[PDB]
mmCIF file with all atom_site columns, C-alpha atoms in Angstrom:
data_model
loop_
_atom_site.group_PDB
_atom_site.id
_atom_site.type_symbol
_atom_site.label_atom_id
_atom_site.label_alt_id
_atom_site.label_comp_id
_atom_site.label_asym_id
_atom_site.label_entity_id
_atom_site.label_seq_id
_atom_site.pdbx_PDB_ins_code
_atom_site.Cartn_x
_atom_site.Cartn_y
_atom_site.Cartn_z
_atom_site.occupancy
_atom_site.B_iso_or_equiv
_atom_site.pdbx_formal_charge
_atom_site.auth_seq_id
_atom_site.auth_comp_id
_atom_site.auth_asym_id
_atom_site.auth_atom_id
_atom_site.pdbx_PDB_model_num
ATOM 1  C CA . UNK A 1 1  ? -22.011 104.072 181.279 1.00 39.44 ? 1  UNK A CA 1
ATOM 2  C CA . UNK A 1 2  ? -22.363 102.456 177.570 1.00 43.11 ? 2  UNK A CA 1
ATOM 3  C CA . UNK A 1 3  ? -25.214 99.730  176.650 1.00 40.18 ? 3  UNK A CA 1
ATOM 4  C CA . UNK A 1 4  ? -25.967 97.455  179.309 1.00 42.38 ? 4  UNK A CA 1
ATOM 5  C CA . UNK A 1 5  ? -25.808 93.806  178.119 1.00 44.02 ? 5  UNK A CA 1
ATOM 6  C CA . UNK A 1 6  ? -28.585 91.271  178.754 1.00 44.96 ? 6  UNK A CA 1
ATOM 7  C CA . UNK A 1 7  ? -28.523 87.820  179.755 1.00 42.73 ? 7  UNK A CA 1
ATOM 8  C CA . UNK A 1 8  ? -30.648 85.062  179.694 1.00 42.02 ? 8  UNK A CA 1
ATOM 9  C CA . UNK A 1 9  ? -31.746 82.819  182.492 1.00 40.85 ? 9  UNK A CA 1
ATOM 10 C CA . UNK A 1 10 ? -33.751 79.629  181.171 1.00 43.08 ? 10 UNK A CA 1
ATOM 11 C CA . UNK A 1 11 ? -35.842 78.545  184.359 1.00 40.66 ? 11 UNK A CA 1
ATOM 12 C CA . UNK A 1 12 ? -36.182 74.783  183.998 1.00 40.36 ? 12 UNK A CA 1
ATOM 13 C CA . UNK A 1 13 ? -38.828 71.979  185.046 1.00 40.73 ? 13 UNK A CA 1
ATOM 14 C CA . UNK A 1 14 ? -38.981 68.729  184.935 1.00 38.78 ? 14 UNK A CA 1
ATOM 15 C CA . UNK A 1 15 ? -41.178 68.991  181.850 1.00 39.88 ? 15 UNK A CA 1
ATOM 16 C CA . UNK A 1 16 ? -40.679 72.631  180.808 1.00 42.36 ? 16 UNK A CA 1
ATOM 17 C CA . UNK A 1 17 ? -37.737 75.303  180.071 1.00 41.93 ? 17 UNK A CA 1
ATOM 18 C CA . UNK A 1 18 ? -38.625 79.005  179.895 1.00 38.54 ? 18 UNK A CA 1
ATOM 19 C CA . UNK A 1 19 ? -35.786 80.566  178.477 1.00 39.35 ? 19 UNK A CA 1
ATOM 20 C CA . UNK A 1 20 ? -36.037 84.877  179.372 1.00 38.45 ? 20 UNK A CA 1
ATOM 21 C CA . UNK A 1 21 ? -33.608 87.489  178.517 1.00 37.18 ? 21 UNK A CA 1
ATOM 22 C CA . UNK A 1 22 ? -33.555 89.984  180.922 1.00 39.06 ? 22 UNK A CA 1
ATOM 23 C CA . UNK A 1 23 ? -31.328 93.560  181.093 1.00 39.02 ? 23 UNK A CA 1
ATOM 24 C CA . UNK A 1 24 ? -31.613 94.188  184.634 1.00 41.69 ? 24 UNK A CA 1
ATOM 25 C CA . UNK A 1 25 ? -32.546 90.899  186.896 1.00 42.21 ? 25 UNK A CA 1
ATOM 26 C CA . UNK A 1 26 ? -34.080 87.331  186.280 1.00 44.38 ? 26 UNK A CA 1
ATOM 27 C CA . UNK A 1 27 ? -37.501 85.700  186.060 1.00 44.41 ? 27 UNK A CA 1
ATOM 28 C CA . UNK A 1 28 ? -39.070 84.540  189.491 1.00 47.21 ? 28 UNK A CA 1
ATOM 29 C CA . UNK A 1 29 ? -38.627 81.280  190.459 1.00 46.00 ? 29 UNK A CA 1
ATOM 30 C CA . UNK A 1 30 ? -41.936 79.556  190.594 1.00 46.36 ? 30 UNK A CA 1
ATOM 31 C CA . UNK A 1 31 ? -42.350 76.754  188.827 1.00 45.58 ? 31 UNK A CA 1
ATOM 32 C CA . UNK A 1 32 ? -38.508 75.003  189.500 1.00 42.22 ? 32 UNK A CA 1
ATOM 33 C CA . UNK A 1 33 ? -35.515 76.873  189.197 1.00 42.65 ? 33 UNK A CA 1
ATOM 34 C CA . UNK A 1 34 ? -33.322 78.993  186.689 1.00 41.39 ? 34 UNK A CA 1
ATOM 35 C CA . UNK A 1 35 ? -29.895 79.588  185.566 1.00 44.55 ? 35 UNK A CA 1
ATOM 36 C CA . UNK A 1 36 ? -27.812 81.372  183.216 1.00 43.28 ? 36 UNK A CA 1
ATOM 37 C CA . UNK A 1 37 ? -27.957 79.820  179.581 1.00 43.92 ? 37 UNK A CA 1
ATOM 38 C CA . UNK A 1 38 ? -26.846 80.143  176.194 1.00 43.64 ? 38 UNK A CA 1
ATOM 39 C CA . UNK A 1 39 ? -29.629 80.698  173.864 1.00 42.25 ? 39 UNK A CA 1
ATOM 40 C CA . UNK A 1 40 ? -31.038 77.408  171.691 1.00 43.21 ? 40 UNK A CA 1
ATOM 41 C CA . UNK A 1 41 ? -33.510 78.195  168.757 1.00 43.61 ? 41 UNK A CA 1
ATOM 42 C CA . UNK A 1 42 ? -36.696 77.827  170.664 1.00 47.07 ? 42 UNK A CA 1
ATOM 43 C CA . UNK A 1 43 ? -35.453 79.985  173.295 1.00 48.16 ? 43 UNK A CA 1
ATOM 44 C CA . UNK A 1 44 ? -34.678 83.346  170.972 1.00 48.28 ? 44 UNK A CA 1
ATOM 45 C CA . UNK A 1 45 ? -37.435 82.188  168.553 1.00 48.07 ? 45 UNK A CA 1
ATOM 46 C CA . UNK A 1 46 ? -40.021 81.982  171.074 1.00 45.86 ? 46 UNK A CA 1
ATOM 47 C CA . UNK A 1 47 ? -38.819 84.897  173.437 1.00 42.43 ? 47 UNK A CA 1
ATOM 48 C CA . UNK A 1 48 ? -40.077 88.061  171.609 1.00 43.98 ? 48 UNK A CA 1
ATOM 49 C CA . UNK A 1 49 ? -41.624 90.273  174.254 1.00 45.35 ? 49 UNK A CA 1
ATOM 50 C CA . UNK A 1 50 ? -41.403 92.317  176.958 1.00 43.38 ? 50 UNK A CA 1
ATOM 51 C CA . UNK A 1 51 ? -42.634 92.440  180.410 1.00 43.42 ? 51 UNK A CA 1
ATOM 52 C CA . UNK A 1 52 ? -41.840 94.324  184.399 1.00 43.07 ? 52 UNK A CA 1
ATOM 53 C CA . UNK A 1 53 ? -39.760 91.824  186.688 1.00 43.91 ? 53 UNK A CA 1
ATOM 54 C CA . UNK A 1 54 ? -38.536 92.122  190.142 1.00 40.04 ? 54 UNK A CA 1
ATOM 55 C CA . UNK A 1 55 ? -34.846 93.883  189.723 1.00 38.31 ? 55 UNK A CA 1
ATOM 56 C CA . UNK A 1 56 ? -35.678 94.743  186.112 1.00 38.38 ? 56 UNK A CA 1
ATOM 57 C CA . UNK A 1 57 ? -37.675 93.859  182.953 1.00 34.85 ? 57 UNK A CA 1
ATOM 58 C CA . UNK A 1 58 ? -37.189 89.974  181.377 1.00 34.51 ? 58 UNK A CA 1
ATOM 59 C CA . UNK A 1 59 ? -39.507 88.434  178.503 1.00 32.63 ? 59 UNK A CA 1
ATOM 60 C CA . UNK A 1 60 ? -39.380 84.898  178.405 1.00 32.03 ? 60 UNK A CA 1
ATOM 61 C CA . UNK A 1 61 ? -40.731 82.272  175.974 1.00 30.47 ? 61 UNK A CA 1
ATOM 62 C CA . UNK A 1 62 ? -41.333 78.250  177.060 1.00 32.72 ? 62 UNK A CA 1
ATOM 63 C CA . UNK A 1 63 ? -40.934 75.096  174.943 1.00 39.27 ? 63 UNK A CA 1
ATOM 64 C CA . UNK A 1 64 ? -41.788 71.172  175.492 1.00 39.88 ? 64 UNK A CA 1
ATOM 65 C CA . UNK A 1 65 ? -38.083 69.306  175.758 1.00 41.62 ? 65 UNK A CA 1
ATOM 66 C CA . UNK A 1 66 ? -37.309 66.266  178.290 1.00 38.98 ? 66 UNK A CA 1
ATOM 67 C CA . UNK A 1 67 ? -41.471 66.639  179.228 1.00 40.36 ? 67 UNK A CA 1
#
């Protein structure tokens, strides 16, 4: 009934994090795995789109850490 909230999942790899927001499912698993996260720097300054995801719509952004 008022504004759905959106989360963020930040699918991680062994060498790569993809942080996505999503308001109505979660990125597809793919590449390793993903999980419900907070939101660092990289992951709301490199997250600025939009795109059509299984349940719902998610945009996502990636960034080098423990690679």
């Amino acid at each position: 009934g008022s504004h759905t909230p959106d989360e963020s999942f930040l699918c991680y790899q062994p060498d790569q994090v993809c942080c996505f927001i999503c308001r109505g499912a979660a990125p597809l698993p793919s590449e390793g795995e993903c999980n419900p996260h907070p939101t660092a720097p990289w992951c709301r300054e490199g997250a600025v789109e939009w795109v059509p995801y299984s349940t719902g719509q998610c945009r996502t952004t990636c960034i080098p850490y423990v690679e």
